[PDB]
Amino acid sequence: THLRPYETLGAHADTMDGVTGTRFSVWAPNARRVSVVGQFNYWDGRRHPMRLRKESGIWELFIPGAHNGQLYKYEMIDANGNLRLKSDPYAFEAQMRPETASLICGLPEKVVQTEERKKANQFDAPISIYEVHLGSWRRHTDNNFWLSYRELADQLVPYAKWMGFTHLELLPINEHPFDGSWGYQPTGLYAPTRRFGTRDDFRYFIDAAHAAGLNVILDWVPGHFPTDDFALAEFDGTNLYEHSTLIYNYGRREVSNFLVGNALYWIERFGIDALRVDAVASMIYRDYSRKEGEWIPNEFGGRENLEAIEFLRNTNRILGEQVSGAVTMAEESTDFPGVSRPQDMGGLGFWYKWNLGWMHDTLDYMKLDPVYRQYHHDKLTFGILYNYTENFVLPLSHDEVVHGKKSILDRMPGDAWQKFANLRAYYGWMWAFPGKKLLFMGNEFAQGREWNHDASLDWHLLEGGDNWHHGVQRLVRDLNLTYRHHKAMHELDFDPYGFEWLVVDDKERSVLIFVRRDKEGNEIIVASNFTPVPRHDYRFGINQPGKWREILNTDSMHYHGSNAGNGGTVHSDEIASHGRQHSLSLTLPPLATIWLVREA
Ligand SMILES: OC[C@H]1O[C@H](O[C@H]2[C@H](O)[C@@H](O)[C@@H](O[C@H]3[C@H](O)[C@@H](O)[C@@H](O[C@H]4[C@H](O)[C@@H](O)[C@@H](O[C@H]5[C@H](O)[C@@H](O)[C@@H](O)O[C@@H]5CO)O[C@@H]4CO)O[C@@H]3CO)O[C@@H]2CO)[C@H](O)[C@@H](O)[C@@H]1O
Ligand SMILES: OC[C@H]1O[C@H](O[C@H]2[C@H](O)[C@@H](O)[C@@H](O[C@H]3[C@H](O)[C@@H](O)[C@@H](O[C@H]4[C@H](O)[C@@H](O)[C@@H](O[C@H]5[C@H](O)[C@@H](O)[C@@H](O)O[C@@H]5CO)O[C@@H]4CO)O[C@@H]3CO)O[C@@H]2CO)[C@H](O)[C@@H](O)[C@@H]1O
Ligand SMILES: OC[C@H]1O[C@H](O[C@H]2[C@H](O)[C@@H](O)[C@@H](O[C@H]3[C@H](O)[C@@H](O)[C@@H](O)O[C@@H]3CO)O[C@@H]2CO)[C@H](O)[C@@H](O)[C@@H]1O
Ligand SMILES: OC[C@H]1O[C@H](O[C@H]2[C@H](O)[C@@H](O)[C@@H](O)O[C@@H]2CO)[C@H](O)[C@@H](O)[C@@H]1O
Ligand SMILES: OC[C@H]1O[C@H](O)[C@H](O)[C@@H](O)[C@@H]1O
Ligand SMILES: OC[C@H]1O[C@H](O)[C@H](O)[C@@H](O)[C@@H]1O
Ligand SMILES: OC[C@H]1O[C@H](O)[C@H](O)[C@@H](O)[C@@H]1O
């Protein structure tokens, strides 16, 4: 019953005696005095000094005629007799950057999650995420002004839906004061940033996404305490939200009530269908060793923060009980055990983990010159080995395209034509490899310079006639749309059944072949030739003979590939290859991957 602090704390419309006003409550149990100051009383806190309930530590007071729209603050004298104003930790709407004051409105209406959105999160579901930072995806050209939440509905959602993505993941939209944090250093946890409009424009924007068939993942930030002025730091003159840099005292009921509630709020009150936490490693460790001693099983040097580890665990359980169908995802880098394993098994309790190791391993490989990929087969092949230890998302995130890491396009080897060929052949490996898929805005049309959180994306790359960039984009649209159609590509991602090697070592040629199969037993053959060399009459074993039809060739004219493929429907011919009792002779185009389906 303390899992929706937001439903009662903060500032909410109420009616007393039949006189409309607004009701104010703030948790500040070591204050000597609290007052609401606002427009309604000309920022004079003498007028409306609040009332303390010693039992709970909450200050209360109802102001008549105070209506939503009007800015306010809490002016307290803290526990030590100092004087400061505080912004509402439960501000649902806030002034913009330097202004930093809370606007009064209430909760939006609860949003009920459809059976359709709930199926889209499930492990058997095709899950292709399109990751976006709203502040830098497009801009108005003349102004270089931000697209509003409302303009983002007009543009982003038709564009995400068009491209065939399944989900839409936004970098944090909690209110924060500086752009370059990207939103991962917040101030107002319950307020969507005013950059792009009002709280209800945000609503209108996710409602619009919903209506177009997209789920919305939201980067959630319980890991980074709010360091700035008016934040929570030393909230009532004591260390209230924080511990004696700065970490939340998660062990304290009201703080967990604050943060677990934040999750329910975003899910229940805006209809967000999934939350992700960046940098769990930061949250669950700390720089210094415990110093009480060594009561440490899973040796981590005793810098583990158990208090925080219980928090993630407890949050996942509550989110399971209370809002089933919404899910949570994590990115953790210390190889911590079982971030995506059930809490009961002792895991963190997250549903999917970002597969940072597979992204590191593949890009390195793809980085290399095609003439050396013979000596590094392991980076493609060892991926499957660890796959069944987590429920993985193949990332290609915003973090991999910034700060001196070249764009994903810049890492490819070739002379121009080569250079795009890798990408087209890469993506079609990625989409065929076990795991859900996440891709960051810009990668889809093979942008060339790094992402600039301070600028629109180089959309101009797609002005002009069909070119290399139109080809990466169109391929991706096909990868998705074919990915979504074939149960094989997504049903058994986490079952050893769903994947089987057909050619783990043909190392010299750098050729790799495997299949993905669903629960019925239908298979899809995928073939990648990671060397610029074309390959004809290539032969290898199959489990199922019959008619095989090329459903996607990475190399085709539309993607500005060679356009040279196998031709038409291929029929299996009995020859002995790899002891499978059936073999195929195929064209392995140059720097391209191939996908085959078997015609009945
Ligand atoms: O050499 C001269 C000059 O060059 C440089 O200035 C360039 C900027 O540095 C550079 O950023 C680029 O600015 C880009 C911008 O970064 C990028 O986001 C992109 O803008 C897109 C919009 O996002 C997109 O919407 C579309 O705009 C639409 C709009 O959505 C729609 O509502 C309607 O208004 O139609 C618009 C199109 O007309 O497309 C644009 C671009 O295609 O592109 C920007 C480029 O304009 O380019 C600047 C020009 O050089 C150097 O920085 C400077 O030192 C040099 O003096
Ligand atoms: O231009 C826009 C285009 O959009 C739509 O076409 C898309 C298709 O709907 C979609 O299936 C996909 O087409 C793929 C195709 O699936 C894939 O097999 C591959 O086609 C290869 C052949 O496999 C290969 O044999 C070779 O064709 C040879 C042929 O064998 C030979 O007998 C002789 O005819 O020479 C041919 C040379 O082309 O190469 C082709 C490559 O085209 O790649 C296709 C393109 O990706 O994607 C299509 C484009 O998005 C609409 O259906 C269509 O009306 C529109 O024109
Ligand atoms: O429309 C009048 C005025 O609006 C804006 O100024 C207001 C601020 O936006 C608002 O935050 C508030 O400022 C208070 C601070 O938050 C608080 O820390 C302390 O300094 O008390 C202030 C109020 O005295 O109120 C002001 C206006 O009173 C806008 O920025 C102005 O351009 C505009 O003139
Ligand atoms: O033609 C390139 C074009 O593709 C997409 O435009 C879509 C549009 O989003 C849909 O609403 C519908 O009209 O189909 C169009 C393509 O046929 C992209 O949205 C757009 O950026 C791009 O220029
Ligand atoms: O000056 C560079 C940038 O610094 C910070 O990101 C500020 O929030 C932003 O307003 C400014 O443009
Ligand atoms: O720096 C950006 C450039 O990187 C590489 O040169 C790409 O080939 C080119 O397309 C892109 O414009
Ligand atoms: O498949 C033919 C290809 O051979 C090589 O990759 C060339 O670099 C490229 O220009 C050509 O298109």
Author numbering: 117 to 360, 372 to 727
Give passages from the manuscript.
Glycogen is the primary storage polysaccharide in bacteria and animals. It is a glucose polymer linked by α-1,4 glucose linkages and branched via α-1,6-linkages, with the latter reaction catalyzed by branching enzymes. In the third step, catalyzed by the branching enzyme (BE), an alpha-1,4 linkage is cleaved, and its reducing end is reattached to make α-1,6 branch points on the polymer.
Herein, we report the structure of M8-bound EcBE, which, to our surprise, identified an additional five new surface glucan binding sites, creating a large glucan surface concentrated on one side of the enzyme. As was the case for all previous malto-oligosaccharide-bound EcBE structures, EcBE with its N-domain removed (the first 113 amino acids of full-length EcBE) was used for crystallization, and soaking these previously grown crystals in high concentrations of M8 was the only path to diffraction-quality M8-bound EcBE crystals. Binding in the five previously identified sites was relatively similar to that seen in the M7-bound EcBE structure for most of the sites, though more glucose units were seen in most of the five sites (compare the 4, 2, 2, 2, and 2 glucose units seen in sites I–V in the M7-bound EcBE structure to the 7, 2, 1, 4, and 3 glucose units seen in the M8-bound EcBE structure). However, M8 binding in site I is quite different from that seen in the M7-bound structure. As shown, three glucose units, not seen in the M7-bound structure, wrap around the 247–264 loop (which connects β1 and α1 of the (α,β)8 central catalytic TIM barrel domain), ending at the entrance to site VII, suggesting that an even longer glucan would span sites I and VII.
